[PDB]
Amino acid sequence: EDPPACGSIVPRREWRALASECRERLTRPVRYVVVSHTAGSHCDTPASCAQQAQNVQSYHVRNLGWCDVGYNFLIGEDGLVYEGRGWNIKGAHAGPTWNPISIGISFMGNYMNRVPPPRALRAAQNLLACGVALGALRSNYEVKGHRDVQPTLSPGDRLYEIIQTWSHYRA
């Protein structure tokens, strides 16, 4: 019986997202969070970041044939969180073994030789507390890098060393 507010998320409709066709659910509460980067263009304003959110979803649906944008949430350098598949629907961001048991949040950019700005990290972190607040994440959830669960550079050398310093990181 826990309903009270948490965080601000730019909702699906606001970034003009094509409707989702996904239906398979995740079991509450989820234990894992997998952090990735989109290795795409970065954006630093709400307008440019909505455009970008759109280009990622578009590529995932129109080209890779997924039911919706791959991630559960995306993060913009504008410091805003963008609604992806949400807390309840299984994403498609870290392979068949990890997708069924995790929330995948992806920073929008290529963080190999750049770090995302403090407002991004802050937003990403708020998001997770919120997940815990809503009961979508276990209070003792675990943060993982994309590269820890799949062979990739994601989330980029720099954002990778950053996230290892997070309270909930577990190699």
Ligand X SMILES: O=C(O)C1=C[C@@H](O)[C@@H](O)[C@H](O)C1
Binding site residues, ligand X, CB under 6 A: 5-6, 129, 133-134
Query: Residue 167 binds which one of its own copies, ligand X, none, with CB within 5 to 8 A depending on kind?
Result: its own copies
Q: How many residues bind its own copies (CB under 8 A)?
A: 60
Helix/strand/coil for 6: coil
Question: Is residue 21 at the binding interface for its own copies, with CB under 8 A as the rule?
Answer: yes
Cβ proximity to its own copies: between 27 and 164 the closer is 27
Rounded to whole angstroms, the Cα distance separating 145 from 71 reads 14
Kindly identify the residues of this chain, within the stretch 137-166, that bind its own copies according to CB under 8 A: 138-140, 148-154
Per-residue binding letters, 41-70, with its own copies (x by CB under 8 A): ---xxxx--------x--xx--xxx-x--x
Greatest alpha-carbon pair distance for the chain in Å reads: 45
Strands 30-37 and 137-145: parallel
Cβ proximity to ligand X: between 8 and 45 the closer is 8
Query: Residue 101 binds which one of its own copies, ligand X, none, with CB within 5 to 8 A depending on kind?
Result: its own copies
What lies within 8 Å, CB to CB, of 153 at 6+ separation is 39, 112, 147
Is residue 67 within 8 A of residue 84, CB to CB? The reply is no
